[PDB]
Amino acid sequence: SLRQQVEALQGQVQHLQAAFSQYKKVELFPNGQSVGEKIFKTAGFVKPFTEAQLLCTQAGGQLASPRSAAENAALQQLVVAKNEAAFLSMTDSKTEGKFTYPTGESLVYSNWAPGEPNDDGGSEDCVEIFTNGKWNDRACGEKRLVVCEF
Amino acid sequence: ASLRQQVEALQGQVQHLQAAFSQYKKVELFPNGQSVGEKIFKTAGFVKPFTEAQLLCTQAGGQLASPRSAAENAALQQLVVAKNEAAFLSMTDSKTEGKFTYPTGESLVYSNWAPGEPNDDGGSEDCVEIFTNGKWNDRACGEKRLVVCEF
Amino acid sequence: ASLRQQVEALQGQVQHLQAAFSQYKKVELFPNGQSVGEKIFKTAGFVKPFTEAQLLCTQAGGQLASPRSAAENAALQQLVVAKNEAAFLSMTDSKTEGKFTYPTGESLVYSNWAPGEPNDDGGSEDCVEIFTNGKWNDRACGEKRLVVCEF
Ligand SMILES: O[C@H]1[C@H](O)[C@@H](O)[C@H](O)[C@@H](O)[C@H]1O
Ligand SMILES: O[C@H]1[C@H](O)[C@@H](O)[C@H](O)[C@@H](O)[C@H]1O
Ligand SMILES: O[C@H]1[C@H](O)[C@@H](O)[C@H](O)[C@@H](O)[C@H]1O
Ligand SMILES: [Ca+2]
Ligand SMILES: [Ca+2]
Ligand SMILES: [Ca+2]
Ligand SMILES: [Ca+2]
Ligand SMILES: [Ca+2]
Ligand SMILES: [Ca+2]
Ligand SMILES: [Ca+2]
Ligand SMILES: [Ca+2]
Ligand SMILES: [Ca+2]
């Protein structure tokens, strides 16, 4: 009796593994990118930084925080697909010239475009990622593609 | 004996699925879904008249948004606010004027009518819209409102 | 005693996972997907030329929509109708004019050609579109059509 029910449970789990794997592909198409244990997903619209940040946090995630070249490339895929530069999570709102993650931690990876960050006009504390994957500091009030990470 | 090996094998596979799925739930509901209790609301992101909206939801295996508590109403309001578009609810007094019912025919267990509503304005409001402030208003079923289904 | 109850507990967990997964699957497919048998169609919601469309689907781990039966065709037609945009299918006769094949090179097992089609109009129609009425027409691959992938 026990072997009969373990065999049934094995069939259930194998079915679930197959169905779940299929569903993951469906979900990520066309607005998500999985890299390592992280998933980026775009909302497909633009918002100013504060509104974008709230959308991600309320969804149970945070704004895209690429922490390696591989993460940056995956994010860049969404930016290229939508043809809209995106906000990253990181700001120097606390200490000018020192960019940090929302937790307050200093950057462990950067991909700044030449000459950046430059606090242009003395008022750029947010960060956008271009279709070329490079970063530029930009005014937080500008509207950029919303991309969150989970 | 070898069944012990198997049960321990399944425990590991189940743990992986639970964890992987937990992450995908959050991803999936961003930005057009809202979970509340065991219910999930999901917007199509566009507007339709009632009959068309109803059909979309039922064909998808769900039904138009049917908030049955203040908590559900607040969750739905989150999507309405996010989209900045009033939505249809499932409920109508199409069968008996003045008596609003769910698609099953059951009477309301919860309502959040704006003051003075429902008023059957012009003698022809049999559907219900939820505003960005979360209040309800009866409205002509012919009007186009945000499509939000529950699953 | 220990092993039988572990089976019982583990199966309650799997069945709760099955239920949650089923719910999240319905949510996922509303409004841009359709399931039919073991196949799932999902639209990107925009138009692209064939080569671009094909690449999007393959990069996503699927392929362009490839209806292999009347039931599959009807499922796909729902999305086309919902978007009101004709969609590319995966199949082409680029290799041998007049002989439409799937990406694997296999000849068609199902077709739903509109009257008069395929006609290779202008001498250069090697891709396939599906209309809102579910019928197919051969069309120039350079044209832009709704992107619908299957998984
Ligand atoms: O953030 C600024 C801004 O995008 C300017 O338009 C550009 O000329 C600067 O180089 C850049 O630092
Ligand atoms: O009850 C309300 C109210 O009468 C409004 O003034 C009218 O614009 C709406 O259509 C109606 O539903
Ligand atoms: O077969 C069709 C048909 O002849 C249409 O009139 C033409 O507009 C399309 O391009 C062609 O593919
Ligand atoms: Ca500053
Ligand atoms: Ca700055
Ligand atoms: Ca700058
Ligand atoms: Ca009436
Ligand atoms: Ca009425
Ligand atoms: Ca009214
Ligand atoms: Ca040809
Ligand atoms: Ca041809
Ligand atoms: Ca033709």
Token pair of C39 as six digits: 């196949």
The Cα–Cα gap between B83 and B77 comes to 10
Specify whether the CB–CB gap between B70 and B76 falls below 8 A: no
The Cα–Cα gap between A53 and A74 comes to 20
Q: What is the dihedral of CA C9, C14, C20, C25, to 10 degrees?
A: 180
Identify which of C118, C110, C109 has the alpha carbon closest to the alpha carbon of residue C136.
C118
**By 3-state DSSP, what share of chain A in percent is helix, strand and coil, each rounded to 5?**
35, 25, 40
Q: Which DSSP symbol is given to A106?
A: B
Question: Cβ atoms within 10 A of the Cβ of C5, count?
Answer: 9
Q: Phi first, then psi: give them for residue B57, nearest 5 degrees.
A: -65, -45
Token pair of B78 as six digits: 């989150």
Residue whose CA is closest, atom 9 of ligand 1?
A120
- Distance (Å) from CA B74 to ligand 8 centroid: 24
Question: Cβ atoms within 10 A of the Cβ of B31, count?
Answer: 22
The Cα–Cα gap between B104 and B95 comes to 12
Region at C90 (left for phi over 0; alpha for psi -120 to 50; beta for the rest) = alpha
Nearest CA distance, B44 vs chain A (angstrom)? 13
Which chain A residue has its CA at the smallest distance from B15's CA?
A13
Specify whether the CB–CB gap between A85 and A97 falls below 8 A: no
Closest-lying ligand 1 atom to the alpha carbon of residue A136: 1
The Cα–Cα gap between A83 and A11 comes to 44
Specify whether the CB–CB gap between C15 and A14 falls below 8 A: no
The Cα–Cα gap between B151 and B72 comes to 13
Q: Which DSSP symbol is given to C69?
A: S
Which of C10, C17, C30 faces B149 most closely, judged by CB atoms?
A: C30
Q: Where are the beta strands (DSSP E) in chain A?
A: 32-35, 38-47, 62-63, 86-87, 126-129, 135-138, 144-149
The Cα–Cα gap between B149 and B141 comes to 16
Q: Where are the beta strands (DSSP E) in chain B?
A: 33-36, 39-49, 63-64, 87-88, 127-130, 136-139, 144-150
Specify whether the CB–CB gap between B46 and B39 falls below 8 A: no
Determined by which method?
A: X-ray
Question: Cβ atoms within 10 A of the Cβ of C102, count?
Answer: 17
C20 class by beta-carbon count within 10 Å (0-12 exposed, 13-18 middle, 19+ buried):
middle
How far, in whole angstroms, is CA B9 from its chain's centroid? 39
Cross-chain residue pair A30–C60, CB shorter than 8 Å:
yes
Size of interface A-C (CB pairs under 8 A): 53
CA distances, A54 to each of A15, A59, A60, A113 (Å): 37, 8, 10, 27
The Cα–Cα gap between A62 and C60 comes to 24
Cross-chain residue pair B27–A10, CB shorter than 8 Å:
no
Cross-chain residue pair C30–B42, CB shorter than 8 Å:
yes
Torsional sign, CA B28, B29, B35, B41: negative
CA distances, A34 to each of A16, A30, B24, B39, B43 (Å): 20, 12, 11, 27, 24
User: What kind and span of H or E run contains B12?
Assistant: helix B2-29
Sequence-ordered list of residues with C-beta below 8 angstroms from that of A81, at least 6 positions apart, any chain:
A30
Which of B17, B23, B31 faces A59 most closely, judged by CB atoms?
A: B31
Q: Phi first, then psi: give them for residue C59, nearest 5 degrees.
A: -60, -30
CA distances, A11 to each of A6, B19, B144 (Å): 9, 20, 46
Mutate which of B27, B41, B77 to disrupt the A interface (most A C-beta within 10 Å)?
B27
Cross-chain residue pair C31–B62, CB shorter than 8 Å:
no
Identify which of C29, C101, C111, C13 has the alpha carbon closest to the alpha carbon of residue C70.
C111
Question: Cβ atoms within 10 A of the Cβ of A99, count?
Answer: 21
How far, in whole angstroms, is CA C3 from its chain's centroid? 44
Identify any residues that bridge with B68 across adjacent strands, giving them in sequence order: none
Identify which of A84, A104, A31 has the alpha carbon closest to the alpha carbon of residue C46.
A31
Identify which of C26, A29, A20 has the alpha carbon closest to the alpha carbon of residue B33.
C26
Q: Name chain B contacts of C83, Cβ cutoff 8 Å.
A: none
Q: Name chain A contacts of C40, Cβ cutoff 8 Å.
A: 22-23, 26
Write A96-102 long-range contacts (CB < 8 A, 24+). Answer: A96/A125, A99/A127, A99/A137, A101/A65, A102/A53, A102/A62, A102/A63, A102/A65
Token pair of A39 as six digits: 């998933």
Cβ of B119 closer than 6 Å to ligand 2, yes or no, is yes
Taking any CB pair shorter than 8 Å as contact, residues of chain B touching chain A are 3, 6-7, 10, 13-14, 17, 20-21, 23-24, 26-31, 78, 82
Identify which of A92, C26, C45, C105 has the alpha carbon closest to the alpha carbon of residue B29.
C26
CA distances, B136 to each of B5, B85, B112, B139 (Å): 57, 13, 6, 9
The Cα–Cα gap between C143 and A39 comes to 33
Token pair of C87 as six digits: 């969609």
Identify which of C107, C114, C36 has the alpha carbon closest to the alpha carbon of residue C75.
C36
User: Domains in chain B, please, with CATH?
Assistant: 1-151 (3.10.100.10)
Specify whether the CB–CB gap between C149 and C46 falls below 8 A: no
The Cα–Cα gap between A134 and B5 comes to 50
User: Resolution of this PDB entry, in A?
Assistant: 1.7
Q: List b or e across B107-116, with b for residues whose CB sees 16 or more CB atoms inside 10 angstroms.
A: ebeeebebee
The Cα–Cα gap between A125 and A135 comes to 12
Token pair of A82 as six digits: 């939508």
The Cα–Cα gap between A124 and C45 comes to 34
Nearest CA distance, B103 vs chain C (angstrom)? 19
User: SS3 sequence, C83-150?
Assistant: HCCCEECCCECCCCCCCCECCCCCECCCCCECCCCCCCHHHCCCEEEECCCCCEEEECCCCEEEEEEE
Identify any residues that bridge with A40 across adjacent strands, giving them in sequence order: A33, A149
Listing DSSP states for C9-32 in one string gives HHHHHHHHHHHHHHHHHHHHHTTT
Residue whose CA is closest, atom 5 of ligand 3?
C121
- Distance (Å) from CA C138 to ligand 3 centroid: 8
B134 class by beta-carbon count within 10 Å (0-12 exposed, 13-18 middle, 19+ buried):
middle
Cross-chain residue pair B30–A3, CB shorter than 8 Å:
no
